[PDB]
């Protein structure tokens, strides 16, 4: 009945702004879960960038890469929306700083440099996700090309549930060792783009780490988060949205509300 009430409220919210909301939330302490369209496909947009940063950290842990190695790109024509990589073009960036920039600022240069040199491209990114037992995630295209968010299109999608599961395994589980997991957590905690999304749905004193995604088409946007409430086990929240028309703008407030509803549902 608590599940069905949350479902009624997500359905209404999706009808109010004429779109589609997909939700998956986990209370990692009780194991209680809430899902709504949690098995349907949604565009990842930039949200995949948060898993790319984990892929890099896995490599670092395996000693295949060094977190301090200089990554140089002095001749590169930087993709649009490269606020961090554009400042360091002259001097380069450590692999660590570059990976976290991809996460924290959604930096496209950081994203594409890392996928071309370290991760084996979109197929490589997908392979990493298969390796943690995620069978839904697929990345098909590079940083600026995956934003088309065409209805029905399977490229560069996942499901809310698969996103949540993966984040749980990467942020809280055992894919990363203690030291490297802590780094990943701090990266997520210092994300800068998510203030109006999951972050806006919880009390100010709860600690949150997140990665957002905004397609810029079909009002498609999302957020996924690890949340450490005061004196309580962590939560995982995954919220994906699309809208009917190509020209519709995303709704931050819908995502925040969907999050509020999801958090109550597993309470």
Curated annotation (Swiss-Prot):
Keyword field: Antibiotic resistance, Disulfide bond, Hydrolase, Signal
Give the induction text. Answer: Up-regulated by the carbapenem, imipenem. Expression probably regulated by upstream promoter elements.
Description of activity control: Partially inhibited by the beta-lactamase-blocking agents, clavulanic acid and tazobactam. Not inhibited by EDTA.
**SUPFAM superfamilies listed in its UniProt record:** beta-lactamase/transpeptidase-like (SSF56601)
Enzyme class, broadest EC rank: hydrolase
Q: Which cysteines are joined by disulfide bonds?
A: 45-215
A GO BP annotation: beta-lactam antibiotic catabolic process
Q: Which Pfam families match?
A: Beta-lactamase2
Which GO terms label this protein's molecular function in UniProt? beta-lactamase activity
> Reaction catalysed by this chain?
a beta-lactam + H2O = a substituted beta-amino acid
Taxonomy, superkingdom: Bacteria
**Known outcome of mutating residue 45 to A:** Abolishes resistance to imipenem, amoxicillin, ticarcillin, cefoxitin and aztreonam in the JM109 strain E.coli
Active site as annotated: 46 (nucleophile), 145 (proton acceptor)
UniProt binding sites for a beta-lactam: 46, 49, 106, 108, 212
Q: What is its EC number?
A: 3.5.2.6
Summarize the protein's role: Class A beta-lactamase which confers resistance to the beta-lactam antibiotics, including penicillins, some cephalosporins and carbapenems, to JM109 strain E.coli. Acts via hydrolysis of the beta-lactam ring. Has penicillin-, cephalosporin- and carbapenem-hydrolyzing activities.
Mention any additional remark.
Answer: The class A beta-lactamase family has a specific amino-acid numbering system, sometimes called Ambler or ABL numbering and often misspelt as Amber. A multiple sequence alignment was used to derive a consensus sequence and then the consensus was numbered taking into account insertions and deletions. This allows use of identical numbers, e.g. for active site residues, despite differences in protein length. UniProt always uses natural numbering of residues, hence there appear to be differences in numbering between this entry and some papers.
Family statement: Belongs to the class-A beta-lactamase family.
Q: What is this protein called?
A: Beta-lactamase SME-1
- Protein source organism: Serratia marcescens
């Amino acid at each position: 009945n608590k599940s069905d009430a949350a479902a009624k409220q997500i359905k209404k919210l999706e009808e109010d702004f004429d779109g589609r909301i997909g939700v998956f939330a986990i209370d990692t302490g009780s194991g209680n879960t809430f899902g709504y369209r949690s098995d349907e496909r949604f565009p990842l947009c930039s949200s995949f960038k948060g898993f790319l940063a984990a892929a890099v950290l896995e490599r670092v842990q395996q000693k295949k890469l060094d977190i301090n190695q200089k990554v140089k790109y002095e001749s590169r024509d930087l993709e649009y929306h490269s606020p961090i990589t554009t400042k360091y073009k002259g001097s380069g960036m450590t692999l660590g700083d570059m990976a976290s920039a991809a996460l924290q600022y959604s930096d496209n240069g950081a994203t594409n440099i890392i996928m071309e040199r370290f991760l084996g491209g979109p197929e490589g990114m997908t392979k990493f996700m298969r390796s943690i037992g995620d069978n839904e995630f697929r990345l098909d295209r590079w940083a600026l090309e995956l934003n088309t968010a065409i209805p029905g299109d399977k490229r560069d999608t996942s499901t809310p549930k698969a996103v949540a599961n993966s984040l749980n395994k990467l942020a809280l589980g055992n894919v990363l060792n203690a030291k490297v997991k802590a780094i990943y957590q701090n990266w997520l905690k210092g994300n800068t783009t998510g203030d109006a999304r999951i972050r806006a749905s919880v009390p100010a004193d709860w600690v949150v780490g997140d990665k957002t995604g905004s397609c810029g088409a079909y009002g498609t946007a999302n957020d996924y988060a690890v949340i450490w409430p005061k004196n309580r086990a962590p939560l995982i929240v995954s919220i994906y949205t699309t809208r009917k028309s190509k020209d519709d703008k995303h709704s931050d407030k819908t995502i925040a509300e969907a999050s509020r509803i999801a958090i109550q549902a597993i309470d």
